[PDB]
């Protein structure tokens, strides 16, 4: 009869999944597949927990998740024959590399005779309609984007959650060896080293996401504490699709009327849509050269300075603590991202924003390709009509004067008083000795003179924008 596959990539959830809902209709069998292809261990652990949660939720419906390793263009032809498939569904991917992959798979599926169901559910709106309304090009200012959104039609209701009623007569063929053939692998099974690993600060999955949403909405009814990961934080769940942006939007509206909302209510989701809209028609969005919206800047090439930044060994505790929290947990505060991005690019190291993007792509759980690239251009003054220097000592000191953020992520500095915790090289030798941390030995000296470096770099950027004008 009619055998369907729903292909999970993003949208790792059973709620608000219109592609999966439409795939199930009229189908006699359904199989949900995830296909495993610069990704760090925290990202992999989050994804694997998403799949684990997906699998457990499908088992409640007497189904399972099918995890396959391979290239989709190799794998789907085999699957189409093995399972006699005539129906394939995906959530639409607006990002240019995902667009490219999906057009190839659609071609393969058509040749095989498989119909392809594509549904928008990872963004609030159809990005093509926003671009058409703005005249064929995405807006490069948030204000114009807000003007476009406010003209759009009201958001339709989120798709019905995949339940037993929705499934109807559809079923999943099961085998007793399913885990051996198609199980969700562990990190070690992928070859990752997990010896140092601690329990995840950000456990993946739709169940965690929906639990966090309820608690977030109840609570809603920077500062030193806000630097720490929040139990009600939602951005990794949005990036992976564990939490629908449309469901979040609808819950926010509901909360507002219980307590004509302004768009700033939806600012977290709208800012995400903005960068997705900017990226979708730009295949060079993640590059400087050949990118039509990116200012050409002669960035320095310095692998050693780049490695010090990436690994949190700059000798600036504020910067190093942030980069350490990012590496250990996969999330840092919005304003912390400003601090380290400025240090790497226009502020201190004059290193290309492309290098920062690569590091965040490995480490940052909530950093979608479109948002990561757009953000690094934004904060390096390379696009979005942006023309701007954070201080790598003062910024931390003002935000967490007692320095407990530093002591949490750089324990070698714990003995230092608050007076020197953000600039330990200024501490007298006796204080360094009773803290048992000599600067330049147990913790590195500052890699750059900030005042000299920032002053020169401000001049360089000013010359760039004088050349532009
Ligand atoms: O987290 C980031 N970016 C945002 N993520 C969500 N919402 C928003 S609004 C907004 C930004 C943003 C960044 C630029 C200013 C306005 C980020 C920052 C630096 C490097 C990579 C990333 Br992935």
Query: 5 pairs with which residues across the strands?
Result: 31, 88
Q: What is the resolution of this structure in A?
A: 2.1
Q: In the 8-state DSSP scheme, what is residue 383?
A: S
Residue listed under structure tokens 């991005």: 341
Q: Where are the domains of the chain?
A: 1-121, 122-167+206-282, 283-469
Among protein residues, the one whose CA lies closest to atom 13 of ligand 1: 375
What's the CATH code, domain 1-121? 3.40.50.620
**Which residue spans within 199-344 are E strands per DSSP?**
none
Determine the Cα–Cα distance for residues 213 and 235; give it in Å rounded to an integer: 11
Q: Does domain 122-167+206-282 have CATH number 3.60.15.10?
A: no
334 CA to centre of ligand 1 in angstroms: 7
Q: What is the DSSP string of 77-98?
A: HHHHHHTT--EEEEE---SHHH
Q: What is the DSSP string of 148-211?
A: HHHHSPPPPPPPPP--HHHHTT-B----TTHHHHHPPPPTGGGT---SS--S-SS--SHHHHHH
CB burial of residue 200 (10 Å; 0-12, 13-18, 19+): middle
Residue 64: phi and psi, rounded to 5, are: -150, 160
Among protein residues, the one whose CA lies closest to atom 9 of ligand 1: 271
The first and second tokens of residue 182, run together, are 């198609």
Residue listed under structure tokens 């058409």: 132
Contact residues of ligand 1, CB 6 A cut-off? 271-272, 334, 337, 341, 360, 364, 367, 371-372, 375-376, 378-379
Q: Is 334 annotated as a binding residue?
A: yes
Full 3-state SS string of the chain:
CCEEEEEECCCCCCCCCHHHHHHHCCCCEEEEEEEECCCCHHHHHHHHHHHHHHHHHHHCCCCCEEEEECCHHHHHHHHHHHCCCCEEEEECCCCHHHHHHHHHHHHHHHHHCCEEEEECCCCCCCHHHHHHHCCCCCCCCHHHHHHHHHHCCCCCCCCCCCCHHHHCCCECCCCCCHHHHHCCCCCHHHCCCCCCCCCCCCCCCHHHHHHHHHHHHHHHCCCCHHHCCCCCCCHHHHHHCCCCHHHHHHHHHHHHHHCCCCHHHHHHHHHHHHHHHHHCCCCCCCCCCCCCCCCCCCCECCHHHHHHHHCCCCCCHHHHHHHHHHHHHCCCCHHHHHHHHHHHHHHCCCECHHHHHHHHHHHCCCCCHHHHHHHHHHHCCCCCCCCCCCCCCHHHHHHCCCCHHHHHHCHHHCCCCHHHHCCHHHCCHHHHHHCCCCECCCECCCCCCHHHHHHHHHHHHHHHHHHHC
32 CA to centre of ligand 1 in angstroms: 32
Among protein residues, the one whose CA lies closest to atom 2 of ligand 1: 375
Q: Which helix (H) or strand (E) holds 321?
A: helix 317-329
CB within 8 Å of 385: residues ≥ 6 apart: 140, 141
- Cβ pair 269, 249 in contact under 8 A: yes
Task: Report CA 13 to chain centroid distance, whole Å.
Answer: 17
Atom of ligand 1 nearest to the CA of 372: 23
Write the class of the CATH domain 283-469.
mainly alpha
Atom of ligand 1 nearest to the CA of 235: 6
Q: In the 8-state DSSP scheme, what is residue 67?
A: E
The first and second tokens of residue 108, run together, are 């393969």
């Amino acid at each position: 009869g009619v055998n369907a596959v729903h292909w999970f990539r993003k949208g790792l959830r059973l709620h608000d999944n219109p592609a999966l809902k439409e795939c199930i209709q009229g189908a006699d069998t359904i199989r949900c597949v995830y296909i495993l292809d610069n990704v760090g261990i925290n990202r992999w652990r989050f994804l694997l927990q998403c799949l684990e949660d997906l699998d457990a939720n499908l088992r409640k419906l007497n189904s399972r998740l099918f995890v396959i390793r391979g290239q989709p263009a190799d794998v789907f032809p085999r699957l189409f024959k093995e399972w006699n498939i005539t129906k394939l569904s995906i959530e639409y991917d607006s990002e240019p590399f995902g667009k490219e992959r999906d057009a190839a798979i659609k071609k393969l599926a058509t040749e095989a005779g498989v119909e392809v169901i594509v549904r928008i559910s990872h963004t609030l709106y159809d990005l093509d309609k926003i671009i058409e309304l703005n005249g064929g090009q995405p807006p490069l200012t948030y204000k114009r984007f807000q003007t476009l959104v406010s003209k759009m039609e009201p958001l339709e209701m989120p798709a019905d959650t995949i339940t037993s009623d929705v499934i109807g007569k559809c079923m999943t063929p099961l085998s007793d060896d399913h885990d051996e053939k198609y199980g969700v692998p562990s990190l070690e099974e992928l070859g990752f080293d997990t010896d140092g690993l601690s329990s995840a600060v950000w456990p993946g999955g739709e169940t965690e996401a929906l639990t966090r949403l309820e608690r977030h909405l109840e609570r809603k009814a920077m500062n030193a504490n806000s630097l720490l990961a929040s139990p009600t934080g939602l951005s990794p769940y949005l990036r992976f699709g564990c939490l629908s942006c449309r469901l979040f939007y609808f819950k926010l509206t509901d909360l507002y009327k219980k307590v004509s909302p302004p768009l700033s209510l939806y600012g977290q989701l709208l800012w995400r849509e903005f960068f997705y809209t900017a990226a979708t028609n730009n295949p060079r969005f993640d590059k400087m050269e050949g990118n039509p919206i990116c200012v050409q800047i002669p960035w320095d090439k310095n692998p050693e300075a780049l490695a010090k930044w990436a690994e949190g060994r700059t000798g600036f505790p504020w910067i190093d603590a942030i980069m350490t929290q990012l590496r250990q947990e996969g999330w840092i505060h919005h304003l912390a991202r400003h601090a380290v991005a400025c240090f790497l690019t226009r502020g201190d190291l004059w290193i290309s924003w492309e290098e920062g993007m690569k590091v965040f792509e490995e480490l940052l759980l909530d950093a979608d390709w479109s948002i990561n690239a757009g953000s690094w251009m934004w904060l390096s003054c390379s696009s979005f009509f942006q023309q701007f220097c954070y201080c790598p000592v003062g910024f931390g000191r003002r935000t967490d004067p007692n320095g407990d953020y530093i002591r949490r992520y750089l324990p070698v500095l714990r003995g230092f008083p608050a007076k020197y915790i953000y600039d330990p090289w200024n501490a007298p030798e006796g204080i360094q000795k009773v803290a048992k941390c000599l600067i330049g030995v147990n913790y590195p000296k500052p890699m750059v003179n900030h005042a000299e470096a920032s002053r020169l770099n401000i001049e360089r950027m000013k010359q760039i924008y004088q050349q532009l004008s």
